Design an enzyme around this catalytic site. Structure first.
Site, PDB file in Angstrom:
ATOM      1  N   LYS A   1      54.056  45.063  16.748  1.00  0.00           N
ATOM      2  CA  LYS A   1      54.848  44.117  17.520  1.00  0.00           C
ATOM      3  C   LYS A   1      54.274  44.040  18.942  1.00  0.00           C
ATOM      4  O   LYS A   1      53.929  45.084  19.537  1.00  0.00           O
ATOM      5  CB  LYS A   1      56.313  44.533  17.548  1.00  0.00           C
TER       6      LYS A   1
ATOM      7  N   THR B   1      57.869  45.084  11.498  1.00  0.00           N
ATOM      8  CA  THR B   1      57.591  45.055  12.938  1.00  0.00           C
ATOM      9  C   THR B   1      58.919  45.051  13.710  1.00  0.00           C
ATOM     10  O   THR B   1      59.018  45.609  14.797  1.00  0.00           O
ATOM     11  CB  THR B   1      56.711  43.836  13.342  1.00  0.00           C
ATOM     12  N   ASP B   2      59.946  44.449  13.129  1.00  0.00           N
ATOM     13  CA  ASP B   2      61.269  44.523  13.724  1.00  0.00           C
ATOM     14  C   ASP B   2      61.736  45.971  13.900  1.00  0.00           C
ATOM     15  O   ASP B   2      62.423  46.313  14.864  1.00  0.00           O
ATOM     16  CB  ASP B   2      62.283  43.778  12.872  1.00  0.00           C
TER      17      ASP B   2
ATOM     18  N   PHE C   1      25.217  39.334  51.062  1.00  0.00           N
ATOM     19  CA  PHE C   1      24.479  39.280  49.814  1.00  0.00           C
ATOM     20  C   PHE C   1      23.067  38.753  50.085  1.00  0.00           C
ATOM     21  O   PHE C   1      22.880  37.580  50.420  1.00  0.00           O
ATOM     22  CB  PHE C   1      25.209  38.398  48.794  1.00  0.00           C
TER      23      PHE C   1
ATOM     24  N   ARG D   1      29.981  37.057  54.666  1.00  0.00           N
ATOM     25  CA  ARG D   1      30.691  36.187  53.718  1.00  0.00           C
ATOM     26  C   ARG D   1      32.092  36.717  53.393  1.00  0.00           C
ATOM     27  O   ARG D   1      32.386  37.892  53.621  1.00  0.00           O
ATOM     28  CB  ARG D   1      29.910  36.047  52.405  1.00  0.00           C
TER      29      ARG D   1
ATOM     30  N   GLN E   1      28.240  45.131  43.185  1.00  0.00           N
ATOM     31  CA  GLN E   1      27.819  46.197  42.271  1.00  0.00           C
ATOM     32  C   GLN E   1      27.949  47.556  42.946  1.00  0.00           C
ATOM     33  O   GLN E   1      28.374  48.528  42.324  1.00  0.00           O
ATOM     34  CB  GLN E   1      26.375  46.011  41.815  1.00  0.00           C
TER      35      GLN E   1
ATOM     36  N   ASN F   1      34.286  37.913  41.494  1.00  0.00           N
ATOM     37  CA  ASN F   1      33.922  37.487  42.838  1.00  0.00           C
ATOM     38  C   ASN F   1      34.422  36.061  43.017  1.00  0.00           C
ATOM     39  O   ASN F   1      33.759  35.106  42.611  1.00  0.00           O
ATOM     40  CB  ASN F   1      32.410  37.562  43.038  1.00  0.00           C
TER      41      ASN F   1
ATOM     42  N   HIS G   1      35.248  32.739  44.777  1.00  0.00           N
ATOM     43  CA  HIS G   1      34.466  32.116  45.825  1.00  0.00           C
ATOM     44  C   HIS G   1      35.273  31.354  46.856  1.00  0.00           C
ATOM     45  O   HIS G   1      36.169  30.556  46.528  1.00  0.00           O
ATOM     46  CB  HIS G   1      33.449  31.168  45.203  1.00  0.00           C
TER      47      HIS G   1
END
Lengths: 285, 285, 290, 286
Positions: free
Chosen positions: B10, B55-56, B157, B174, B221, B247, B249
């Site tokens: 479930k 599942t109940d 970067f 940035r 990284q 990342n 932007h």
């Protein structure tokens, strides 16, 4: 045939404005929508775009205005945008701008705020709506949305009508959970800080809802809690002319375990996505 | 046709657990998913449901265990759920439980906590995953999700490969915005709530650096590896860590064609596309 | 510490490819995600980006490849993307691409298809995943997702275990609603019409679910319906090597009106957003057919 | 301080109605919201709930009415709900009901329809809104939503104002993609087949957007396409008293590849989630 309303614009123009005072950066990210009404209707009637300011130009203009005048206050921004299209184009007879501010908050740890790091913190979201007719002043609404709160008591619901379809048992205790939507109009002759007001209504809303931090405060109705917030807001804040509120009643129902030979009431509750109650009201001065 | 993997269960079992110590209420709202693998496959092969726990019934069991064993930690909760089905049913050869905790926070103003009011505060969301084979111990992963953060500087970067499809200029400054997903497996020797808060704090430490000046990040990284490294050292019982950093932007809006010089005060938030930097390290050391 | 996995890329690169043969326009809009693994780890260890292909470049490359090779199969597209990064950069040791196709459908009325108008029709969505190691071939998965279906009968659930926590009544009739997720691997040696395969598996899935029109077909278990689809698919389609399926069981419960002195069973049902059952399984080819 | 408007109710009441005519099953799944305004305000002023019909009761009522009365027309369902609360409670001065129908479609292959299988098919979604004051008639709107369409030509945009913030080049060809929202009020004294009216407005909408299937009529303006739909609809359907439309203009921009040494014009486009244009208008009839 006849026209009732026309409007065209750009929606979801997103912008992040950054101000840099040395190592100390400040931001405001918004999403903006702009609608314009033209006096001519030949665009609709014949396909004549000669009065159309391209929606792409509206988008550029929002970007430019944010650069020239900054944002500072979301209401100011929208007024400037309105002011810009009413001044620059004489066949623009109405402008409307909706602005929603991304709830960024400066990082905070042990009481000190970070110079340039922010965490997304949706604990109430500031939005505003400004509308302005040609040669009339601007009407300003501010608002709270997306504020989700839950208290595990000091709420009850009883004394209601019981017709042939009423299975709801009365209670003196229940969970109250909601997502606040609160929108208020301003009077005129300004003199409003806007940002301070917003913080204030929010402080109040959360007061009427949760009450004193030691005892809390019983609410016999979502309707009452709603109206109280309204009265206390128009009191503590003179420049507000009306307030619309909308409170979902988001249900956390006691899970009946009888059929399993167990007694719950009421430690395990079921949060329901739907349906939910919705209590609304608008009061003015 | 050889079977490779089977499982049924479930999903999205939601529960709010409320504990009342006088006027002082404590809650934990979770959403739970449970999967079981059975030894027989006759339900798949022939439609024979004779080994199926409905599942109940699985849902009922989550509700019951939440009542009896409480919700101390979502890791505890999930182990309980796992142990229950392996112990109670001899044909259940595998159990897996996923739990996500709703980021409710006790109301606060100036350090004073409310006794029973909570505000939804998604500033990092605790989840966990427990898997357990018949007669083997449970494997516990815990994790952070939906932690959205932005810093407007101390990120660059440069020094990358420039092929014929590279239009990206190198930059020394940035925006870095991301949504942290962080998942760690445990050894076997643990305060789950304390561990979680700790890893979260390391995460926010490596991302934003010192609150006075920040810390330059030359590579997402790199920021990723540091968090992994600072974490396995500062927390011995962690056996490995998986991280995923989008990342997201925020690009400078070039206003050249309109006769404005922006760089870099007005930015465009893009919903997509976005970079995705990921890595998994394991011990030691 | 030691490394277990690394990967970086661009997600949600969206593209619409338009082809124009006179008045007759044909389109394909996709959303693409690309991950690469490098041999160097110096990016993580020291912050040395000298081996990094910028994610912006990956994005540009997806756009270019859609222009140069077009995209007649999303699987083809993803293969082209993979091979491009493995060939052009020798320190790229693995490439993985996920592609999802927007379920655009040509306008249709009274039997005629429009030359250049399309309507968004999410009645099953084609996606694929291609992964490829340096100097190894590519593994191709295709799939269906977001296919939502409901039958109001010919479904039952009984003969299950009843422990102290079981309040579920056995039933011979119930609503069955689901959202199909179906993902299969291909063998090799080629000879695959990716788009032709996809329509047939969908055809199968929808067959095993609703059975013959006019009468329908009883399902005793979601697990059974799942396995049948798998078996019938590996049979009718030789180049498929395995199949993973995931069937939510989205509940429509009878609304008990006893407390109001009314008898429902079973005309007004409550659609539940959650919770829901989830039945999953993966079979691979080795034995069996039919 | 004084009241301007009040209303309370239950939202997102979901129901699946199943009718069985032998072996042939018919369904309608809807999601419903109902709001009521009361004459007394003591619930707001003092916490006096003595006039409140519990929203749970409102939920029960939708379930029951779905059972005794039918669904079929979503408009009928909403009027029934309105009727019930204005009738049964005299302190209820207004009722408002919003209904949205889940776009299930019977399984089909070349005209042969399955007896009890349905596939979720959001190619236009039917909704309606009914509002009613005490001892007044019901005001009925119906509408289309979530109808997403794209044409890759026969659309242009030129002859616009070019100020100093206008970088948009004029174009004679472009993609037009939109998500139609269309809502119309009915006259009154209406002998209306709501379901047929709905299919009729929808195909008018799709007609003006894509034009003839062979050729494809040029649209010089989204404002223009909007007005045509409004005009063709009030004509083809006398009982419609007005129509409101909202057409997003969802952008597909040519990806400029010059900086990479490629000429793309225009086979590869970028689908943008935002921002987007929004063209709206409401015309009424005389």
């Amino acid at each position: 045939v006849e026209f009732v309303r026309t409007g065209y614009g750009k929606d979801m123009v997103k912008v992040l404005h950054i101000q840099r005072d040395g190592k100390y950066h400040s931001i405001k990210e918004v999403a903006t929508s702009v609608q314009l009404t033209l006096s001519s209707k030949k665009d609709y009637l014949h396909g004549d775009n000669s009065d159309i300011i391209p929606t792409d130009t509206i988008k550029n203009t929002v970007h430019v205005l944010a650069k020239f005048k900054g944002i500072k206050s979301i209401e100011a921004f929208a007024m400037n945008i309105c002011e810009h299209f009413l001044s620059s184009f004489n066949h623009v007879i109405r402008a409307q701008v909706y602005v929603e501010e991304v709830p960024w908050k400066r990082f905070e740890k042990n009481g000190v705020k970070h110079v340039h790091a922010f965490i997304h913190t949706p604990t109430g979201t500031h939005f505003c709506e400004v509308e302005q007719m040609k040669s009339g002043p601007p009407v300003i609404h501010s608002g709270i949305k997306d504020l989700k709160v839950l208290k595990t008591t000091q709420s009850g619901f009883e004394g209601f009508i019981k017709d042939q379809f009423t299975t709801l048992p009365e209670v003196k205790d229940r969970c109250f959970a909601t997502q606040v939507y609160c929108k208020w109009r301003y009077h005129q002759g300004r003199d409003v800080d806007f940002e301070a007001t917003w913080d204030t209504v929010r402080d109040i809303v959360l007061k009427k809802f949760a009450g004193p931090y030691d005892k809390g405060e019983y609410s016999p109705s979502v309707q009452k809690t709603l109206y109280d917030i309204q009265v206390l807001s128009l009191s503590r804040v003179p420049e507000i002319e009306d307030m619309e509120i909308s409170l979902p009643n988001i249900h956390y129902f006691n899970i009946d375990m009888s059929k399993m030979g167990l007694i719950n009431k009421e430690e395990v509750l079921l949060p329901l996505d739907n349906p939910y109650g919705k209590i609304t009201g608008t009061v003015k001065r």
